[PDB]
């Protein structure tokens, strides 16, 4: 396994502070990151130019991991949806890769966001998970102006072993997630 700064920060700084703050009686009870699942709802590639191999490339540069395709569960009229149509990507980051992604999200991506005023305090799942959406992929250090044909955002799910929101805010905050309020 990789030594990555954020992973270390978790074990060294965050683990203890948390146990202090909630008084856990077991090492396994203290909150862990489980998975970061990144999604591209897309579907601007429904019929059009389902060469979103361009996006799969962009996403694979961002995560270091090749996304897999999502296709429609049912046919839909008003959105123009034949069932089985390729309308999104999803990459499930775990372990070392999850950490590296977050490391740069937290250090570099979020900072580059336009008029960034902090992550949303209320986007907490209510079972201790957090979700946030991006509008553009130029936020990541790996995707330059030169390489992009068009602006597309994404959905980020960060999944946690905490049972409650209240614990999750703590873990995520301590790790360095910047919250507006």
């Amino acid at each position: 396994p990789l030594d990555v700064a954020l992973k270390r920060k978790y074990y060294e700084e965050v683990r203890p502070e948390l146990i202090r703050r909630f008084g856990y009686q077991n090492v396994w009870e203290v909150p862990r990151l489980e998975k970061v699942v990144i999604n591209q709802g897309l579907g601007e590639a429904k019929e059009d130019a389902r060469i979103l191999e361009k996006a799969a490339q962009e996403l694979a540069l961002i995560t270091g991991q090749k996304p897999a395709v999502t296709r429609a569960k049912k046919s839909i009229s008003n959105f123009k949806l034949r069932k089985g149509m390729p309308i999104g990507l999803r990459v499930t980051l775990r372990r070392d890769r999850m950490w590296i992604f977050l490391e740069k999200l937290l250090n570099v991506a979020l900072p580059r966001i336009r008029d960034f005023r902090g992550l949303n305090p209320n986007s907490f799942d209510g079972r201790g998970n957090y979700n946030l959406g991006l509008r553009e992929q130029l936020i990541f250090p790996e995707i330059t102006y030169d390489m992009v044909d068009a602006l597309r955002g994404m959905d980020i799910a960060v999944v946690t072993t905490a049972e409650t929101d209240e614990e999750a805010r703590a873990l995520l905050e301590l790790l360095g997630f910047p919250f507006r309020k």
Binding site: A60, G64, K104, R112, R117, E142
Partner: peptide, 23 residues
């Protein structure tokens, strides 16, 4: 300078967390 991991060895960015107003 941030020592991390990427699909690219060296990256130049205009801003980071260390110098960003909100941070």
């Amino acid at each position: 300078v941030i020592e991390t991991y990427s699909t690219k060895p060296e990256i130049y960015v205009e801003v980071c967390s260390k110098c960003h107003p909100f941070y």
